[PDB]
């Protein structure tokens, strides 16, 4: 997901502006749906929502626009259990042997014959929650097991929380409403208002442990691998209870990162840290936010936003529609030097040609260089110490950068890696001359529509994740509901698209109308006022009751 | 009863629901949404009810790519009657009305559907829905950040045997 909110000090109009570019699946239980909800006098909001939910999840109203991105906070903790040495179904808490609980579920299964069998399945549970087994990493042997405590299980506040956000007037109000109810499960919220405030909150439901408990309650090895793991044999590693949190065991709102500015805030699924570099967010629990190196989408966006030129609506749009493969900025210059250094290696020539010819884009018309670049990068990322300038806590925005071609073994490894990448591409069935849009598509019935964008892991702000199907890459997630909102005095002006269209049903007039436009990168008005709605020559109307 | 909505659709099948209260609003939402995505919703409710293997057998997957039976075991565990009840009891009146409205309007569309925009018409799993179903969907989404990402791991959690 991306989000940028621009404040009165940076927009071309002295007003708020928001770019919402969340990245979620193109199918299934998180497929965005657009709608506009109004109870005249007390609710008027428009945006996108999730299947089955009668609230808008990402949207705007008269003076506010807000959006979300998946945060890096922990929303659960693993607990390593010490098993009773006498009974691997009992576990020790403060040296006291506790019995696991068993809850059975029964599921009906349709067999070969069309008939139903009943399968019974035992789920074991500890005081923390259910046990989980990841073979080779989280085992259940005679000495230890792992249980998982998910903080969102007891979050009954989620729908009231979004309903409340749908009723928010402005940024301060939105912040108040989120901080009071603490029903946001596991996303950041970014917002802008008419007055020109720009807000970032890492305000979600996060397991709370007082800061002094962490060093001794952590499982150190599991924590280095990114897992929120705690010692489950010590009662002092239970989540801390603080009467200011809206739910027992979660982090109070005052302890979660917030940044309220008038220039900009941004997030591309990194931590709260570099939301705006002029004001780093630091000193939080490692369950909350850690100062880790930012991914290429954040680096890209920060490269566009920093400075003092004012940001136009169009500027934010193009950051999406440019399809620029930011990761190329880190490695293609040196990679190309290596190419020139090796002219007349019969094995490398198609590669280098392709890469020198490449526009550094994930456009429909972008050349095969993107394909060669992607597979190069997949092998490059598995090499040790090949960065010219490694990551540097002090230069978080411009590092890592460049290939250490000066070190002779790295040069051999980068070369070998480009030869392997070339061989993989060349082995596959790519027609000569073919473009990125000829390969990456979304299937609509028995047709195909070429889709621009590429994987977020290569720095393409228009992140599109695809997978191999037959002869094509089939799009499965990424850019989905797009909304770019400003505030002229007349009323909120919003522009965007739903990439995959309103309806997943092939029979629908709205199965692919917006997909066609997404292919062409032709965003459209999102009509909000009665005047804009009545202006629409496609307007239709049904009243229903029962 | 006392459910009413006024729905306008602008270009691309975008609905604009107006109602005098949360129940009418939900009514218009569920009806507009069914028109476009009845089958998606029915499929996801099946998953969230742990009924995949009932309708489709053990050989397929949910849309989140879990095998049907491990997926069913996980959702049955997650969406136990007592969890749904406690969850409903914590909902405010307004949210409750939103939800009852949605279920009613979704159902109304199903009652009238002739296939014009619904491809799974006649399938046994395309069924009337209930507020519990939307709570099943909600809870499924809540745990996508937590125990949901360990659904396979939960199903596989079994105590050791005799091994050395
Ligand atoms: N956080 C969170 C999720 C969620 C969980 C339960 C729920 F009821 C609504 C949203 C979620 C999933 C997909 C997309 C989003 C959104 F925040 F809208 F981008 N949220």
Q: Of A1, A8, A73, A285, which one is the catalytic site residue?
A: A1
CA distances from A188 to A175, A199, A202, A285 (A): 12, 10, 5, 16
Q: By the 8 A CB rule, do B57 and A125 touch?
A: no
Instruction: Round the CA-based radius of gyration of chain B to a whole number and report it.
Output: 18
**Residue A358, phi-psi category: left (phi > 0), alpha (psi -120 to 50), beta (remainder):** beta
Method in brief: X-ray
Can you tell me the distance from the alpha carbon of A468 to that of A475, in angstroms, rounded to the nearest whole number? Answer: 9
Q: Is A70 in the pocket of ligand 1 (CB under 6 A)?
A: no
* Bridge partner list, A460: A325
According to CATH, the topology of domain A76-150 is Penicillin G acylase, beta-roll domain (2.30.120)
Can you tell me the distance from the alpha carbon of A360 to that of A341, in angstroms, rounded to the nearest whole number? Answer: 21
Can you tell me the distance from the alpha carbon of A166 to that of A55, in angstroms, rounded to the nearest whole number? Answer: 7
Q: Is A57 in the pocket of ligand 1 (CB under 6 A)?
A: yes
Contacts 24+ apart (CB under 8 A), A239-244: A239/A77, A239/A149, A239/A151, A239/A207, A239/A208, A239/A209, A240/A208, A240/A209, A240/A210, A240/A213, A242/A208
What DSSP character marks residue A240?
Answer: P
Residues 6+ apart with CB under 8 A from B149: none
End-to-end CA distance of chain A: 40
Q: B109: which 2 tokens?
A: 């569309």
Domain that holds residue B106: 1-164
Nearest CA in chain B to A71: B145
Residue A155 sits at the chain B interface (C-beta within 8 Å):
yes
If one counts the domains in chain B, the total is 1
Sign of CA dihedral B129, B135, B139, B141: positive
Q: How many C-beta atoms surround the C-beta of residue A522 within 10 A? A: 11
The 3 state secondary structure assigned to chain B is CCCEEEEEEECCCEEEEECCCHHHHHHHHHHHHHHHHHHHHHHHHHHHCCCHHHHHCCCCECCCCCEHHHHHHHHHHHCCHHHHHHHHHCCCHHHHHHHHHHHHHHHHHHHHCCCCCCCCCCCCCCCCCCHHHHHHHHHHHHHHHCHHHHHHHHHHCCCCCCCC
In the block, tokens 């880790």 appear at A292
- State whether A34 and B8 contact (CB < 8 Å): no
**Which positions 32-51 of A are in contact with B (Cβ < 8 Å)?**
33-40, 43, 46, 50-51
The residue of A28, A70, A107 whose CB has the most chain B CBs within 10 angstroms, and thus the best one to mutate to test that interface, is A107
CA distances from A107 to B52, B55, B58, B71, B129 (A): 9, 11, 11, 10, 20
For the domain covering A1-75+151-290+475-536, report its CATH number.
Answer: 3.60.20.10
**Residue B63, phi-psi category: left (phi > 0), alpha (psi -120 to 50), beta (remainder):** alpha
Q: A428: which 2 tokens?
A: 């596959």
Nearest by CB: B55 against A106, A110, A150: A110
Domain range list for chain A: 1-75+151-290+475-536, 76-150, 293-474
Mutation choice for ligand 1 from A187, A203, A498, CB with most ligand atoms inside 8 A: A187
Q: By the 8 A CB rule, do A186 and A65 touch?
A: no
Q: Tell me: domain A293-474, CATH 1.10.20.140, correct?
A: no
Can you tell me the distance from the alpha carbon of A101 to that of A490, in angstroms, rounded to the nearest whole number? Answer: 61
CA distances from B91 to A27, B95, B97 (A): 28, 6, 10
Reading across the β-sheet that carries A524-525, which strands appear in turn?
A264-267, A2-6, A17-21, A481-486, A493-498, A524-525
Give me the CATH number covering residue B134.
Answer: 1.10.439.10
Instruction: Round the CA-based radius of gyration of chain A to a whole number and report it.
Output: 26
SS3 breakdown of chain A: % helix, strand, coil, rounded to 5?
25, 30, 40
Can you tell me the distance from the alpha carbon of A206 to that of A377, in angstroms, rounded to the nearest whole number? Answer: 34
Angle among Cα A64, A65, A70 to the nearest 5 degrees reads 140
Q: By the 8 A CB rule, do A47 and A34 touch?
A: yes
Can you tell me the distance from the alpha carbon of A122 to that of A144, in angstroms, rounded to the nearest whole number? Answer: 19
**Which positions 103-162 of B are in contact with A (Cβ < 8 Å)?**
104-105, 108, 115-119, 133-134, 137-148, 150, 153-160
Can you tell me the distance from the alpha carbon of A400 to that of A392, in angstroms, rounded to the nearest whole number? Answer: 7
CA distances from A434 to A81, A279, A472, B42, B84 (A): 55, 45, 12, 40, 53
**Centroid of ligand 1 to alpha carbon of A224 (angstroms):** 27
Relative to the CA of A204, which ligand 1 atom is closest?
1
Q: A354: which 2 tokens?
A: 């392709």
A1: annotated active-site residue:
yes
Task: Give the resolution value in Å.
Answer: 2.3
Cis peptide before A400 (omega within 30 of 0): yes
Can you tell me the distance from the alpha carbon of B90 to that of B111, in angstroms, rounded to the nearest whole number? Answer: 31
Residues 6+ apart with CB under 8 A from A290: A72, A271, A273, A284
């Amino acid at each position: 997901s991306n989000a940028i909110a621009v404040g009165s000090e940076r927009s071309a109009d002295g007003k708020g502006m928001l770019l919402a570019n969340p990245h979620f699946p193109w199918n299934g239980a998180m497929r965005f749906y657009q709608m506009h909800l109004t109870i005249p006098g007390r609710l008027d909001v428009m945006g996108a929502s999730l299947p089955g939910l009668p609230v808008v999840n990402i949207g705007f109203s008269r003076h506010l626009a807000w959006t979300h991105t998946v945060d890096t906070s922990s929303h659960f903790t693993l607990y390593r259990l010490a098993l009773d040495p006498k009974d691997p179904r009992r576990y020790l808490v403060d040296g006291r042997s506790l019995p696991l609980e068993e809850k059975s579920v029964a599921i009906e299964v349709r067999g070969a014959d069309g008939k139903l069998s009943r399968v019974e399945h035992k789920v074991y549970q500890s005081i923390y929650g259910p046990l989980v087994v990841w073979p080779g990493k989280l085992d259940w042997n005679r000495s230890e097991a792992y249980a998982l405590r998910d903080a969102n299980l007891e979050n009954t506040r989620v729908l009231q929380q979004w309903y409340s956000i749908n009723q928010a007037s402005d940024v301060a109000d939105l912040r108040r409403r989120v901080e009071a109810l603490q029903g946001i499960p596991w996303v950041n919220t970014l917002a802008a208002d008419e007055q020109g405030n720009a807000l970032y909150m890492n305000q979600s439901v996060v397991p709370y442990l007082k800061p002094e408990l962490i060093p001794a309650c952590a499982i150190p090895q599991l924590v280095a691998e990114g897992l929120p793991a705690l010692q489950g044999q010590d009662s002092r590693c239970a989540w801390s209870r603080d009467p200011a949190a809206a739910q027992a065991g979660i982090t109070p709102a005052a302890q979660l990162p917030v940044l309220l500015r008038r220039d900009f805030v941004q997030n591309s699924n990194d931590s709260a840290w570099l939301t705006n570099p002029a004001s780093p967010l630091q000193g939080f629990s490692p369950l909350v936010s850690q100062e880790k190196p930012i991914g290429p989408r954040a680096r890209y966006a920060l490269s566009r936003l920093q400075g003092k030129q004012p940001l136009e609506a169009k500027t934010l749009e193009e950051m999406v529609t440019a399809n620029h493969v930011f990761s190329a900025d880190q490695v293609l210059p040196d990679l190309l030097r290596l190419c020139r250094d090796n002219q007349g290696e019969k094995s490398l020539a198609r590669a280098c040609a392709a890469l020198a010819q490449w526009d550094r884009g994930a456009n429909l018309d972008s050349g095969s260089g993107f394909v060669y670049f992607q597979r190069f990068m997949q092998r490059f990322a598995e090499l040790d110490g090949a960065w010219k300038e490694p990551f540097d806590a002090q230069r978080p925005l411009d590092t890592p950068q460049g290939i250490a071609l000066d070190r002779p073994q790295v040069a051999t490894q980068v070369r070998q890696a480009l030869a392997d990448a070339a061989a993989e591409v060349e082995k596959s069935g790519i027609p000569d001359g073919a473009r990125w849009g000829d390969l990456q598509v979304s299937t609509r019935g028995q047709e195909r529509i070429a889709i621009p964008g590429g994987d977020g892991h290569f720095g393409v702000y228009n992140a599109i994740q695809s997978v191999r199907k037959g002869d094509h890459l089939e799009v499965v997630g990424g850019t989905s509901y797009i909304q770019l909102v400003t505030f002229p005095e007349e009323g909120p002006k919003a522009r965007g698209l739903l990439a995959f269209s309103q309806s997943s049903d092939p029979r629908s007039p709205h199965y692919r109308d917006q997909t066609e436009l997404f292919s062409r990168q032709q965003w459209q008005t999102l009509p909000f006022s009665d005047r804009q709605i009545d202006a629409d020559p496609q307007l239709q109307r049904l009243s229903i009751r029962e | 009863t006392g459910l009413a909505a006024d729905i306008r659709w602008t270009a691309y099948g975008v609905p604009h629901i107006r109602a005098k209260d949360e129940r009418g609003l939900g009514y218009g939402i569920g009806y507009a949404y069914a028109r476009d995505n009845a089958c998606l919703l029915a499929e996801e409710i099946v998953t969230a009810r742990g009924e995949r293997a009932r309708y489709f057998g053990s050989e397929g997957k949910s849309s989140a790519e879990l095998d049907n039976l491990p997926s069913d075991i996980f959702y049955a565990w997650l969406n136990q009657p007592e969890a749904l009840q406690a969850f409903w009891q914590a909902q405010t009146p307004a949210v409750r009305q939103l939800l009852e409205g949605y279920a009613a309007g979704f159902n109304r569309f199903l009652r009238e559907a002739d296939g014009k925009t619904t491809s799974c018409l006649g399938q046994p799993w395309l069924r009337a829905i209930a507020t519990d179903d939307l709570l099943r969907l909600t809870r499924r989404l809540l745990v996508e950040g937590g125990v949901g990402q360990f659904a396979d791991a939960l199903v596989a959690a079994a105590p050791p045997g005799a091994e050395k």
